[model samples]
Target: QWALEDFEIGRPLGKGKFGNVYLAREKQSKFILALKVLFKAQLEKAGVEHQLRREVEIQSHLRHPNILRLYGYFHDATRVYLILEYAPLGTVYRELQKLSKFDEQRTATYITELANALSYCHSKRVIHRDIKPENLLLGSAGELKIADFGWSVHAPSSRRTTLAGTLDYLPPEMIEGRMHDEKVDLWSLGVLCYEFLVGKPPFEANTYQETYKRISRVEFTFPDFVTEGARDLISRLLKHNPSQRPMLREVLEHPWITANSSKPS
Candidate 1:
């Protein structure tokens, strides 16, 4: 049990639609964390109360180095505060913007980490409906951490119907309004890989309809810079048929990951 008085607040880390994440430190243990303060009225008016509940429930239980930790939460009269691990290096999206694109080694390392984490999530029947650079944070050592669970779902059985997640990363089945399972994450991973290497999403287009068509058709061309091994892995994951998409284990085993990533499990 924690209260506002338990921690000393610092500068703001980031701002969101509902609230801001602040750098905070617990007075008792001197432990640093990010305090995500969400306005109660904003959440209620948005009708996303259930979404917050689900995010907290699913994220708090997940234990993985690549996934951000949700230590605990508390609420006051006006707002809810979520205690979270502080990733000092901040969001991957910002880094991506600065770098324009990642080199093969870094991209492969991140993909390997994400595959391992997603494997763990799948084993627990948790589906991360969204997997993008914006949702990922960098730890002090520059390791990747999945930082958001707003669109994640704990689907223990059967397929889910909701078309949740970002536009560029949505899987074909999700775009088509078909029933989807955990394999949707695989499709997102493929899209993420392409983005990491190319500095943009594979299906990106001038118009929404064009992008949708490209995703539905699984249409995209790689620049000459993408290696054969990387291409193979991306192609395998971007399959329109969910069952045909390779599993996370298979992704880790892919030649591109093995050849480029220095760390091996």
Candidate 2:
């Protein structure tokens, strides 16, 4: 039951095609938050009202520490306003841009958090269609927080074939226009891990056409920087067959994840 004027709006946090996210503070509780404003007309024009609703609904019900929090939303005549948890450290993409590539320790820590969150999401019958670094934010405590759900689906049963996601993170089935399940997330998880450790996705190419081909071919060579355990995990995960990919539990049990790291579970 929040009103437009009940909060103080600060500097812009980020921008998207629809609108911008702002740093906001609730007056009564003095709680800092992020306010995402989307243009009603733009959403209508794009015929994505259902998409926005799903994103808001999915993020609101998910209560994982690694998943971004969606408090609630309100709408006016021209815009829809969504209240979101603030992640002070920004996004993993920005950090990767600065660092080029994360060390194995950092990569393993992030993968563990993401795997745990994805396992929780799947248990709730939620499938996160997009799992790229840009959708991953860093909390003030440097914890990995999944920030976007615009392409998520709540699948109680059956499979989905919507080819919706970042170009680099799309699984082979998605690229080939075949039916896919939650295992798509596992494929993207492997892509995210590779990008985290190598500074680029395994199948990245000069053009979308070549990238799509490489993705379908499932032919890739790991760099020297990738450790043995990580190489094995990525190879098994990036398979053309979704059924062959390992589950999240298996991912957590991988030697890379079990290796000594001071990260909190």
Candidate 3:
């Protein structure tokens, strides 16, 4: 059980709809962390108390190099404070804004890390329904870290039917209101790969209806600059049938990832 006085609060790291994250340091060990403070009243009003509790339970138990660590949590009468691993470089979404799009080298590196991390999550029966740049952060060395778990679920058996995750990254099954499993992450990975290389999502459109149509049909094209290996990998991942998508291990071993990734698989 931690108290507010146990941490030396620094500055605000980022602000969310219901809370703000702050830079903090443990008083005793001097360890740096990100303190996420959420208002209990706001959460209750939003009807997302259960969601927050699920996120905390899932994120706290997960341990991986590419996944942010949830050290612990405590609460005051009005607010809840979560202790989290601090990624100094901030979100990958902001970095994408500066570069427009990442080079093949960088994209492959991130893809490798994502694949490895998702593979581990699958082993634990955790399905990360949402996987997007906004949910990913960069560590001090520019390594990718999954920082959000708002849409994740622990499904030990049976398929999930709830339509969740970003529109641009939604799989065909999800868009069609069909049951989905861990393979949904594969589709998001493919979309993320395309966005990393092209500076935009593959199935983006002017309206929600059009975007849904494109995603449900898996309709998208690659720019001329994308290598054949990368195109092949993305094509494999974006298949309409969930079972047709490559497993995370297979994605890690794909020719494009094998050829371009700086990190050893």
Q: Which candidate is the best by lDDT?
A: 1
Give the clash count for model 1: 0
**How many clashing residue pairs appear in each of the predictions shown?**
0, 0, 0
* Residue pairs that clash (backbone atoms under 3 angstroms), model 1: none
Q: Assess candidate 3 and give its lDDT.
A: 0.87
Error of 2 at 202 (Å): 1.0
lDDT of 1: 0.88
**On residues 28-108, what C-alpha lDDT tens digit does candidate 1 reach at each position?**
999999999999988887778877888899999999998999998999999999999999998989999999999999999
Better of 1 and 3 by lDDT: 1
In candidate 3, position 175 carries an lDDT of: 73
lDDT of 2 by residue, 45-75 (tens): 7788877889988889889898999999998
C-alpha RMSD between model 1 and the true structure: 2.0
Candidate 3 local lDDT, residue 148: 76
Candidate 3 residue-wise lDDT, 37-107, digit = tens: 99999878777776788789999999899999998889999999988999999898999999999999999
Q: State the weakest 10-residue window (summed lDDT) of model 3.
A: 156-165
How does each model score on TM-score?
0.94, 0.94, 0.93
Q: Score each candidate by Cα lDDT.
A: 0.88, 0.85, 0.87
- So what's the TM-score on candidate 3? 0.93
**TM-score of candidate 1 versus the correct structure, residues matched by position:** 0.94
